[PDB]
């Protein structure tokens, strides 16, 4: 199911280094998130570093959502995670797309400039309207 | 898009000492879950503790559940996740909404009574009937 | 609210030795997931190991995706959790479901043939189509 989405350029590295975001089939559920860095950064263990995309969107449908999650091989096979371990963007979020790394392995790993380090899912979302009740 | 949600207070600090869950904005896809708690609960790095919120919900419509999240910044600044790392609460769940909080990092945290240390969103969701294949 | 989704066995045990993956209840939003393992798996802390279940699945829907979670149990309890923290399948995944296991606490944790070690719920997704523009 398809939904127009804006999406702003940060950095001018975007599109002439690495390329935006797309999805890889039309079967996908997510889109992988690359690293916009002037130079590699070398992520011991344990450590967190905040790495930017060069890129916001701007959702605006409060009925939608998106989900930043860690990419299956870099975290199962390289320890390579989010710091947030999930990071929900509101749909009135309109800053840049940053992602916290973190290292929850036991070895080094360098994050390489455009490098996909992360994946972002969009999901339906409800707000609740609280109904109290002094039992159920 | 909202949906009511029957919510029942467990312990009378709730709203007297901090306030009931509220969406920041109209745009927002979670809510914040604060601790309801006697004294303050000093983490050291690498344990868990069980933080009550004072709060049940009673989802009740089967498409529907909640998830539970990390609050972005305190676990990208300060390694204060999840134990479950992600908390999925279902329709029919009445219990009390418990938060397992995780110092995933290096530095000490103490949580506050009444601080907010969650995020919770509510997803559709869809319950699979198996269809049985030997090939697809 | 029911989806058809057909699935294959890949390992005979699956049903014989251990069940298929069923709804607790018809208000639960998760599948709990079984590891089809010969001989139990002894975790480590802070040790990674990729658990079969024996099962594929094809989601197909595009509109339709499935998150892999930890259980809240092993998470809160026993520091037993997910290697990439939450596990997307795509609806065109057809391979395996494969659950990275890693123990992110501080004791070893044998890991049963057959225990249930994760679970999945099924939502929808959206894919964005971007919009771009210089200024929101």
């Not at 509101?90 to 992602?99: A, E, H, P, T, V």
Request: glycine content about 10%; overall charge negative.
């Amino acid at each position: 199911m398809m939904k127009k989405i804006d999406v702003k350029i940060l950095d001018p590295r975007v599109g002439k280094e690495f390329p935006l975001p797309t999805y890889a089939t039309s079967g996908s559920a997510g889109l992988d998130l690359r690293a916009c860095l002037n130079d590699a950064v070398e992520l011991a263990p344990g450590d967190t570093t905040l790495v930017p995309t060069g890129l916001a969107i701007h959702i605006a449908d409060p009925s939608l959502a998106a989900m930043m999650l860690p990419r299956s091989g870099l975290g199962h096979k390289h320890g390579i995670v989010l710091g947030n371990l999930v990071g929900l963007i509101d749909s009135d979020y309109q800053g840049q797309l940053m992602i916290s790394v973190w290292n929850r392995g036991q070895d080094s790993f360098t994050i390489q400039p455009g490098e996909r380090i992360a994946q972002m899912i969009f999901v339906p979302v409800v707000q609740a309207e609280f109904n109290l009740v002094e039992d159920f």
